Amino acid sequence: MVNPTVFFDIAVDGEPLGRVSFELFADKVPKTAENFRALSTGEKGFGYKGSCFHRIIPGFMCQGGDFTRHNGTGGKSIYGEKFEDENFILKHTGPGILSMANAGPNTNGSQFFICTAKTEWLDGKHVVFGKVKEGMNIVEAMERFGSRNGKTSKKITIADCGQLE
């Protein structure tokens, strides 16, 4: 049992910005990784496909997963409306980490953010469950189209996504 990999063809307002890829730490956070896997691949008939990045904060993070709301509250797991924080083994060690946005303890579901720095201020508050494998330079471009008030200077989206297992 190894970590699944995923891809996302990132699109800014529909213009292809490039493929990006991530690894999902099933090896430590199986619930979170599996929950996310299915949402990226779209195999639950919803999820990440088209569901954008809603808070892009340069050198902080790129939050997304607004697939049922549009304000940083969308998303629920494949098993149900929230699940627990699995653990805090994996920490916000630097940019290119990936962690579950939640509403506090045991309220994580389908929002994540790409850490675009060492988001150690979030250590103990969010489930790190992935990392950028590839297209880190596209995440760096995505941030140019962020702001800091999170509301982007351009709509950042996923044209397509799936697994690269």
- Is residue 19 annotated as part of the catalytic site, yes or no? no
The pair phi, psi for residue 144, each rounded to 5°, is -60, -30
**Three-state SS letters, the chain:** CCCCEEEEEEEECCEEEEEEEEEECCCCCHHHHHHHHHHHHCCCCCCCCCCCEEEEECCCEEEECCCCCCCCCCCCCCCCCCECCCCCCCCCCCCCEEEECCCCCCCECCCEEEECCCCHHHCCCCEEEEEEEECHHHHHHHHHCCCCCECCCCCEEEEEEEECC
Terminal CA-to-CA distance of the chain, rounded, Å? 11
- Beta carbons within 8 Å of 45's beta carbon, 6+ residues apart: none
Active site residue 163: no
Residues 17, 24, 90, 122: which is the catalytic one?
122
Task: Report the distance separating Cα 70 and Cα 47, nearest Å.
Answer: 13
Q: Are 6 and 158 in contact (CB under 8 A)?
A: no
**What is the set of domains in the chain, with CATH numbers?**
1-165 (2.40.100.10)
Choosing from 53, 60, 112, 129, which is the catalytic residue? 60
User: Which residue out of 22, 25, 53, 55 is catalytically annotated?
Assistant: 55
